Motif scaffolding. Structure first.
Motif, PDB file in Angstrom:
ATOM      1  N   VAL A 190      -4.241  11.053   1.701  1.00  0.00           N
ATOM      2  CA  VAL A 190      -3.148  10.119   1.439  1.00  0.00           C
ATOM      3  C   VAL A 190      -3.039   9.052   2.529  1.00  0.00           C
ATOM      4  N   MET A 191      -3.987   9.028   3.487  1.00  0.00           N
ATOM      5  CA  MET A 191      -3.874   8.133   4.635  1.00  0.00           C
ATOM      6  C   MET A 191      -5.093   7.240   4.755  1.00  0.00           C
ATOM      7  N   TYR A 192      -4.882   5.999   5.195  1.00  0.00           N
ATOM      8  CA  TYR A 192      -5.995   5.081   5.400  1.00  0.00           C
ATOM      9  C   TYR A 192      -5.614   4.136   6.533  1.00  0.00           C
ATOM     10  N   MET A 193      -6.556   3.868   7.437  1.00  0.00           N
ATOM     11  CA  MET A 193      -6.316   2.935   8.527  1.00  0.00           C
ATOM     12  C   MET A 193      -7.344   1.803   8.465  1.00  0.00           C
ATOM     13  N   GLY A 194      -6.859   0.575   8.246  1.00  0.00           N
ATOM     14  CA  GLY A 194      -7.741  -0.571   8.265  1.00  0.00           C
ATOM     15  C   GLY A 194      -7.331  -1.681   7.299  1.00  0.00           C
ATOM     16  N   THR A 195      -6.604  -1.350   6.223  1.00  0.00           N
ATOM     17  CA  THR A 195      -6.057  -2.373   5.330  1.00  0.00           C
ATOM     18  C   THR A 195      -4.700  -1.927   4.785  1.00  0.00           C
ATOM     19  N   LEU A 196      -3.787  -2.887   4.591  1.00  0.00           N
ATOM     20  CA  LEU A 196      -2.470  -2.598   4.040  1.00  0.00           C
ATOM     21  C   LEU A 196      -2.506  -2.547   2.515  1.00  0.00           C
ATOM     22  N   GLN A 245     -15.390  -3.971   3.003  1.00  0.00           N
ATOM     23  CA  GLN A 245     -16.685  -4.029   3.667  1.00  0.00           C
ATOM     24  C   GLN A 245     -16.623  -3.198   4.935  1.00  0.00           C
ATOM     25  N   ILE A 246     -17.637  -2.362   5.169  1.00  0.00           N
ATOM     26  CA  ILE A 246     -17.766  -1.593   6.402  1.00  0.00           C
ATOM     27  C   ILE A 246     -19.248  -1.462   6.763  1.00  0.00           C
ATOM     28  N   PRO A 247     -19.595  -1.280   8.060  1.00  0.00           N
ATOM     29  CA  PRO A 247     -20.974  -0.965   8.448  1.00  0.00           C
ATOM     30  C   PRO A 247     -21.516   0.288   7.762  1.00  0.00           C
ATOM     31  N   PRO A 266      -3.482  -2.406  12.019  1.00  0.00           N
ATOM     32  CA  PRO A 266      -2.849  -2.943  13.233  1.00  0.00           C
ATOM     33  C   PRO A 266      -1.910  -4.051  12.767  1.00  0.00           C
ATOM     34  N   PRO A 267      -0.686  -4.154  13.329  1.00  0.00           N
ATOM     35  CA  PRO A 267       0.291  -5.123  12.838  1.00  0.00           C
ATOM     36  C   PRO A 267      -0.316  -6.524  12.720  1.00  0.00           C
ATOM     37  N   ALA A 268      -0.108  -7.163  11.559  1.00  0.00           N
ATOM     38  CA  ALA A 268      -0.510  -8.532  11.259  1.00  0.00           C
ATOM     39  C   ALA A 268       0.467  -9.139  10.241  1.00  0.00           C
ATOM     40  N   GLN A 269       0.669 -10.463  10.326  1.00  0.00           N
ATOM     41  CA  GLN A 269       1.467 -11.207   9.357  1.00  0.00           C
ATOM     42  C   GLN A 269       0.957 -10.907   7.949  1.00  0.00           C
ATOM     43  N   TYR A 270       1.865 -10.527   7.048  1.00  0.00           N
ATOM     44  CA  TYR A 270       1.519 -10.084   5.710  1.00  0.00           C
ATOM     45  C   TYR A 270       2.702 -10.377   4.787  1.00  0.00           C
ATOM     46  N   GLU A 271       2.386 -10.680   3.526  1.00  0.00           N
ATOM     47  CA  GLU A 271       3.407 -10.972   2.540  1.00  0.00           C
ATOM     48  C   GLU A 271       3.609  -9.745   1.652  1.00  0.00           C
ATOM     49  N   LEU A 272       4.850  -9.239   1.636  1.00  0.00           N
ATOM     50  CA  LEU A 272       5.257  -8.176   0.728  1.00  0.00           C
ATOM     51  C   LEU A 272       5.811  -8.786  -0.564  1.00  0.00           C
ATOM     52  N   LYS A 273       5.157  -8.509  -1.696  1.00  0.00           N
ATOM     53  CA  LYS A 273       5.641  -8.981  -2.991  1.00  0.00           C
ATOM     54  C   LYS A 273       6.511  -7.897  -3.626  1.00  0.00           C
ATOM     55  N   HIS A 274       7.696  -8.318  -4.072  1.00  0.00           N
ATOM     56  CA  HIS A 274       8.655  -7.471  -4.758  1.00  0.00           C
ATOM     57  C   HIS A 274       8.000  -6.714  -5.908  1.00  0.00           C
ATOM     58  N   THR A 299       2.645  -3.050   9.238  1.00  0.00           N
ATOM     59  CA  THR A 299       1.691  -2.132   9.845  1.00  0.00           C
ATOM     60  C   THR A 299       1.417  -0.907   8.956  1.00  0.00           C
ATOM     61  N   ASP A 300       2.368  -0.576   8.063  1.00  0.00           N
ATOM     62  CA  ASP A 300       2.217   0.503   7.091  1.00  0.00           C
ATOM     63  C   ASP A 300       2.817   0.073   5.755  1.00  0.00           C
ATOM     64  N   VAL A 301       2.131   0.399   4.656  1.00  0.00           N
ATOM     65  CA  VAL A 301       2.725   0.218   3.344  1.00  0.00           C
ATOM     66  C   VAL A 301       2.563   1.513   2.554  1.00  0.00           C
ATOM     67  N   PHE A 302       3.616   1.891   1.824  1.00  0.00           N
ATOM     68  CA  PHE A 302       3.605   3.089   0.998  1.00  0.00           C
ATOM     69  C   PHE A 302       3.653   2.671  -0.470  1.00  0.00           C
TER      70      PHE A 302
END
Ligand SMILES: Cn1ncc2c(Nc3ccccc3Cl)ncnc21
Length: 317
Positions: free
Chosen positions: A206-212, A222-224, A248-256, A302-305
């Motif tokens: 249920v966990m992933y680190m690298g994209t929101l 894409q990965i090596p 890692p925290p980055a500017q991102y748009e949350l759509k309703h 930094t996290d989206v559920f």
């Protein structure tokens, strides 16, 4: 030669109460070892008339107590009860406002990460294995969140006052959750090396680190490869009530209506502040006790559920 005595109860779990008769001339310390009353360390206090009939926590120093402690907390860590009590002594003084029908926490002692985690936990499907955690979660859902917060601190080995990471908190709590049925199937494809499939179960499902973006994970990322060149990783199958995507925290748009809830992090490893964004009839931004509404939201996420039940890809490799 003249002794005054009261009756009290000792416990490790607050369910099994063990009758004690104590001498008012000696400390609780001298009688039970480390003793707590509602979180407060009363080791060096002497029994008082107002104490008669109250429940005190003690460290598990006999076989019965060890078994009870284990069955309640699912941990054998000798420091646990001490750390829990310590945390409780602080959390019981925090305020837990209802905000938009969710139990939050008014800011205190750098607790922004705990408020965010607490809000998240009320919006995804999760059952905890340790009776302590599940009991406390039910009460927190009902508005009494002080125990729950103290337990989250104790389980994550965090002290009141220390900056925390939501992803790390969720991860530790997830270790104590029943996620055994959760299943993830991944494919990684190299034009050279071929296609390699991976099945994960449990927390790792249920966990992933690298994209929101959950969509992005479905489409491919894409990965090596071992080849040294770039491969595509994509989700093939998911069976779980939710998924957590972190980055890692980055500017991102949350759509309703495209996600359930999200963590915003402003700052770095040394200092910063979390806010919680939830999708309801519109976008709510819960900042401890403060609530703001908006149609759109753009911030350092930094996290989206996301909600899930059972997903199968339509990609044919
Ligand atoms: C640039 N930066 N700063 C923190 C951080 C992070 N984890 C983290 C640690 C403590 C509190 C909050 C968070 Cl989100 N993960 C990735 N990049 C990060």
């Amino acid at each position: 030669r003249e002794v005054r005595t009261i009756k009290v109860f000792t416990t490790v779990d607050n369910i099994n109460l063990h009758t004690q008769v104590v001498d008012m001339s000696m400390t609780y310390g001298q009688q039970f070892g480390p003793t707590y009353l509602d979180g407060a360390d009363v080791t060096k206090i002497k029994p008082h008339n107002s104490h008669e009939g109250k429940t005190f926590y003690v460290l598990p120093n006999d076989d019965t107590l060890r078994v009870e402690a284990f069955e309640y907390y699912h941990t054998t860590d000798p420091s646990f009860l001490g750390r829990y009590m310590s945390a409780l002594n602080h959390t019981k003084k925090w305020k837990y406002p209802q905000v938009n029908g969710l139990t939050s926490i008014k800011w205190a002692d750098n607790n922004s990460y705990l408020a965010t985690a607490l809000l998240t936990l009320q919006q995804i499907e999760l059952k905890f294995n340790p009776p302590a955690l599940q009991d406390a979660y039910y009460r927190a859902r009902a508005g009494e969140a002080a125990n729950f917060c103290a337990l989250i601190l104790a389980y994550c080995n965090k002290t009141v006052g220390e900056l925390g990471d939501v992803r790390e908190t969720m991860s530790y709590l997830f270790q104590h959750a029943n996620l055994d049925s959760c299943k993830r199937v991944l494919n990684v494809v190299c034009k050279t090396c071929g296609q390699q499939q991976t099945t994960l179960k449990g927390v790792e499902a249920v966990m992933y680190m690298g994209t929101l973006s959950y969509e992005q994970f479905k489409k491919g990322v894409q990965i090596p490869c071992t080849c040294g060149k770039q491969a595509t990783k994509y989700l093939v199958q998911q069976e779980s009530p939710f998924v957590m995507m972190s980055a890692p925290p980055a500017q991102y748009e949350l759509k309703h209506g495209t996600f359930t809830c999200a963590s915003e992090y402003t700052g770095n490893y040394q200092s910063g502040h979390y806010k919680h964004i939830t999708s309801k009839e519109t976008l709510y931004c819960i900042d401890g006790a403060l609530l703001t509404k908006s149609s759109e939201y753009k911030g350092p996420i930094t996290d989206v559920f996301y909600k899930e039940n059972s997903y199968t890809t339509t990609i044919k490799p």
